[PDB]
Amino acid sequence: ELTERGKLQIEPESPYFDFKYAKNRPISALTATPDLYLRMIQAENDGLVNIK
Amino acid sequence: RRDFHILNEAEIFQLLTRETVDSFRKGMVIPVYVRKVESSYMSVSTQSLIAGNIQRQDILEPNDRRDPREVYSVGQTVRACILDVDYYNFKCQLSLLRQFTENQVAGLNVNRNPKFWDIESENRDRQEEIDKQREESRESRVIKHPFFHNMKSKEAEDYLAARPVGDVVIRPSSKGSNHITISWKVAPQLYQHIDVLEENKDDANAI
Amino acid sequence: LKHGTYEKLDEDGLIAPGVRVSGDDIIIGKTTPIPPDTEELGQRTKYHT
Amino acid sequence: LHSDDDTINSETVEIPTSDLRKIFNVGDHVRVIHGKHTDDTGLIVEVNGDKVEFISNQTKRTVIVFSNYLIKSTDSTVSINESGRFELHDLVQVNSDLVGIVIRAQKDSFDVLCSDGKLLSLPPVSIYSKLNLNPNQQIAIDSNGVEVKVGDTVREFTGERRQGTILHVYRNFLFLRSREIVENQGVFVTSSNRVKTI
Amino acid sequence: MFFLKDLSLILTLHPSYFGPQMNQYLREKLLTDVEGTCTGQFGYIVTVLDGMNIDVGKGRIIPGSGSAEFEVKYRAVVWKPFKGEVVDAIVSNVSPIGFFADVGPLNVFVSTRLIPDNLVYNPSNSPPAYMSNDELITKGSKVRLKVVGTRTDVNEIYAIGSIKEDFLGAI
Amino acid sequence: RKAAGLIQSIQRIGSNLVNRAHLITEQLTSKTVFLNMASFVYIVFDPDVERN
Amino acid sequence: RFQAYRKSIKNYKLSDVDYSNERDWIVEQLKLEKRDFLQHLTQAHSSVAHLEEKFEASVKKIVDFIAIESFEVPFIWNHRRDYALHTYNDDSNNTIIVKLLNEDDLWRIVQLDLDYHSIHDKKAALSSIYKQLDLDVVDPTYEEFFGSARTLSELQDIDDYLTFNYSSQVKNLTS
Amino acid sequence: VSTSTVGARRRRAKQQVDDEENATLLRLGPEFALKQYDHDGNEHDLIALSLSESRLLIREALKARSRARNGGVIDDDELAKVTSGAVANGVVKKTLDYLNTFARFKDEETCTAVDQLLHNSSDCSVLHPFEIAQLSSLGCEDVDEAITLIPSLAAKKEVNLQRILDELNRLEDP
Amino acid sequence: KESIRRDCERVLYFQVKNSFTKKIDQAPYQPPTYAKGTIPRVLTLSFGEGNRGDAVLGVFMDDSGDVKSQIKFDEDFQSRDFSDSLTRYIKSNNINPDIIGISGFNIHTKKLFDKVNELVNEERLTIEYDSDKHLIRVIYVNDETARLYQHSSKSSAEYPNRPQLAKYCIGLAKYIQSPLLEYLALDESMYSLHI
RNA sequence: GUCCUUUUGUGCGGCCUCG
User: Fold this and answer.
1) Where, subcellularly, is it found (chain D) (predicted)?
2) How many CA atoms lie within 13 A of B51 on its CB side?
3) What is the sign, positive or negative, of the torsion defined by CA atoms of I150, I151, I155, I159?
């Protein structure tokens, strides 16, 4: 889910646009693409998104 | 150890241009510096010095009939869409048509699967972003005239109530800065508002 | 160099009699030597001396 | 002199410099006089007699320097001129496929803002090269189709709708300088498609 | 520590804004230029009291430039740390060199050399923490620290705390 | 750090290592360190020099 | 490099029971991480029985080398490769070599060796706390979820359980 | 940017030891001295504020501004979003979170009683306002703890510190 | 969340390790009719940025690692004079390259590469072991380590009287002669590369 | 493929010009 900062600053240019509105992504498949989940965490640390 | 690695076409292109074959391919849109303008072809230079080329069928719009020289000039920079890349000779072909330069926005293969992407929230957010791009600025109008008063319709009627029949007041109109409503007292507690359309206006506040 | 023109000079650096001259135009061409900079990094014919 | 007696504290004594040792209290801004860590400033943390330890301001790490090399300077005011190979706000090529703009400069390190927004701290030697792009290459085109050169002020319409003056151009990215964004001294990166010219 | 102070600002207005809404536009400009700023002399300005009824006076026309200069006086709530003061904090990040806490908008850094030795940093812990036998301090944990030094920047303030003394550490 | 100590020890003894066993007989290295490093450092053998 | 890795370890020399527990823990961790490789091994080499037992024995031998003999990964990979692979003769007398482990797996075994000592310290501290509690009768839940505990999260959960249910003894020893 | 009402301070030759900022020595500098001047030049005392008083004031001012901007028609997030400036929004959000997680007195009447107790008391008539703010903010429980945290209170031994702390704990909502 | 973070960090760590292993696992270029691992004799050329003013600088390194006969060409590289000078340089008895390496800063390097390759092919400049004869190879050289080498103070101390482009050519030749040692010489700077 | 450009002395002395 997106915070207000994420609601604004998540532009197509940004690397975080890949997972801006992601859902129903199983945990078992996360290890296949570590960069995706690391980018999600780094976006969370910026205060843009929240991983639920 | 393995044998000495010898660069291929993609590695040579990346070495000499610092643009990968992923970030520079078919369909992308880039700004190019025009260098030559001719009757049938146009020669441009990109940011990384890759020599481009555009043909007569890709310079002008189908409904256009003017000569290419009249339309563009040397030294001008324009947007163009890539139609082919020659990774060995460092040459590319481009098109300046509207159908290629502007419509192709979604250049990334984002997996918008309905079960894996929140389509409705994205649509609502995009609709709200368009509804915020529709925002505009507006301000009141000031007119200098002895019988002009910055009053509402009811305010003008109340102002004309204290005055006898035949006196005239002028107020701004609700239809826009190009319209003026003139209110005059027809009878006691009876007033007529007449809208006047302005033409050849020097300014919004001007008459 | 200066902002004026140099095309009116001859090979010997001097203008010839009978030529029209306007303000600032160069009529005597003279140069003085200068110890060259690090341009010996490679400037085939375009290193200033 | 300072002492518990008030009458002694109102006296001035002239003392030779050969019998004086500086007193460094914990939590004081001090600037290094001489050594490998010359012109480094920070706050004193530990005073182990002759050896003094302090958290630096530039490197932001603890540095151990002898007390003879310290002067109590409440402000750094360090000038980075005549150092490295990079002026402030230079567009530096970090590596083969990475580029950025120098945000802050230091004696033996630099702060670089990437095109995607990530900040890096690197030594000067690790930087691949400096991009000396030609003026014709340093031109971009806004969303309307109007040309925007360096020094042209533009203001966005998407996103946070910020505004700035163009500082550098790289591909489609515009490096803008702004007054109100104090977070990175006004330097924020946006694509040219996001801005409209004023 | 929070305080009430009487502050003043100089506001310059371009002649294109010389309209009836001049006072309100000056008020909003003052609010945007004062709310949230950080000045080393004063600390942090958080809010301005009576923000919609501030007197702006009469502006003076600058000779040779046309623009008017306004002197706006206002009362605002200001927060500024002091050397040798003990305040509460919340840990925001854990690192081998020390932990970073947040005291409102101010971020305070405490190095390991100002941390007691029994609070050994455990990077294997989830989340990583500086833990002892009876104490465990991690991200989001309440901590009471004493401000030792303050570093002033152009528009920023950097503070350094310590927890090596009594009645400090985990709370 | 061990590499620099080894280089200094070799330069003390004469900057030439005749045999692998001299890393133990000359006390240059300890037992386990030599056991690890013995087969990864080599001494070029010239048959014309060593007729025996 | 081993000294640099083990510089943070308070005490590296484990007892025999703790060492066997360490070997079992590393075997289980590798089994968890290399599930797809083990599935490929089982499917494509169905004719050979008990290959996973050979994998367990090989992993235990590598842990033995790294911990007791202190061999680094290149030395094991070059001069101890026979313990990292299994050979057999098929029905057609075909010599077949199966590579159970690679160099990256040796590095992962080094990493797990380094990782387990934090778990061991946490478990020792938890057991010491339980000893200072000095229950009259052993708590079946504590021993039940302490014997099977294999991550520090479960140890933290047991610590929370102990400090809650026996808070009075903790207060007496000492909110 | 903003300039204080105190000016002058020109060059001299003497140097004083009461110039460095120090909470323990109660040396708050010229701009935070015990004696201040308002816009009219009249005498004014330094106004310290505890977290309860500060929270009440910021909430009152923010809700007044929000009501005024909305044509005179409670949530911290919306109230923070009322203000302008992204950095300002972040700063006010951080202050709101800090005040909320350490609010000793969330009630106006409790804060009023605390202020009256800490002001009208005979012992507190000599107490510095910074000491009052520190006592009402830190929520100390012991005289020794208060002396260790606040070194200034050590020299003022004519204050009934223990009973005042117990009254503060009583007024504090558990 | 912490567990998945740790697992993904492990996977990314191993991916980066494998990528770096692919980067540094390169033997020196093997000259023909010689056993693998033999150090070749290298000649490297580069004009720099490719501008009008920029001249071509050459450096010849023998199989013993000693730089020999750095030269500067004082003519336009698109002319016949440059071709004659390069033909005289290569065919000199004191210089016997096994490979010719070329690298540069932009697309102008392609013209130099094509010019040198065409000259070598047309003049039939063969490897001089001083039987079967083989033409000298012309390749593009990856200059990941040369650009950091040319600014390093160690290189400046090693060659005080030489310009930066000469150090770039020496870095390219050293990279051809031993990629591993050239990566090692970067020290702390090798973590900033594109791995 | 080629096109591409930037700035000025000082200090005295003398003779003049308009009041």
Assistant:
1) Nucleus
2) 10
3) positive
The strand J neighbours among I residues 87-126, by Cβ under 7 Å, are: 111
Is the distance from CB of H123 to CB of H153 less than 8 angstroms?
A: no
Please name the helix (run of DSSP H) or strand (run of DSSP E) that holds residue H118, with its range, or none. Answer: helix H108-120
Residue with tokens 């692919």: I22
Q: Which residue of D has its CA nearest to B29?
A: D172
Q: How far is CA D161 from CA A48, E34, E38, F48, in A?
A: 17, 21, 23, 80
Nearest CB neighbour to H3, from listed E8, E86, E105: E8
Q: Give yes or no for a contact between G40 and G52, defined as CB atoms under 8 angstroms apart.
A: no
DSSP H helical segments within chain G, as ranges? 2-5, 16-33, 35-44, 51-64, 73-79, 103-133, 140-147, 152-165, 167-173
Q: Would the Cβ of B91 be found within 7 angstroms of any atom in strand J? A: no
| All chains having 3 or more CB pairs closer than 8 angstroms to chain C | I
Q: Which residues of chain G does E122 touch, with a Cβ-Cβ cutoff of 8 Å?
A: 118
- The C-alpha atoms of residue D141 and residue C49 are separated, in whole angstroms, by 42
Residue F26: strand, helix, or coil: coil
D76, amino acid identity: S
Which CATH superfamily is H49-174 part of?
RNA Polymerase II, Rpb4 subunit (1.20.1250.40)
Distance from I1 to chain A by nearest Cα, in Å? 9
- What are the structure tokens assigned to C37, written together? 């900079």
CB contact under 8 A, A9 and D160: yes
Q: Which CATH superfamily is domain E1-82 in?
A: RNA polymerase Rpb7-like, N-terminal domain (3.30.1490.120)
Instruction: Tell me how far apart the alpha carbons of residues D111 and B37 are, in angstroms, rounded to a whole number.
Output: 44
CA distance D136 to D134: 6
For β-strands B91-95 and B51-55, DSSP reports them as parallel
Helical (H) or strand (E) element with H146: helix H143-149
What is the rounded CA–CA span in Å between residue A36 and residue A32? 9
Tokens describing residue G7: 């510089």
Q: Which of I30, I51, I140 to mutate to test the interface with B (most CBs of B within 10 A)?
A: I140
Distance CA G28, CA G149 (A): 13
* CATH 2.30.40.10 for domain E83-171: no
Tell me C40's DSSP state.
Answer: G
Cross-strand partners of I60 = I43, I68
Q: Which amino acid is at I185?
A: A
Domain boundaries of chain E, sorted by first residue:
1-82, 83-171
Q: What is chain A's percent helix, strand, coil content, to nearest 5?
A: 55, 5, 40
Q: Please state, in angstroms and as integers, the Cα–Cα distance from residue I88 to each residue in I73, I81, I82, I97, I130, following that order.
A: 12, 11, 10, 13, 17
Residue nearest to nucleotide J7 (CA to C1'): C2
Which of D161, D155, H85 lies closest to B129 in space, CA to CA? D161
Place of tokens 């002892």: E132
Angle at the Cα of I194 from the Cα atoms of I193 and I195, rounded to 5 degrees: 100
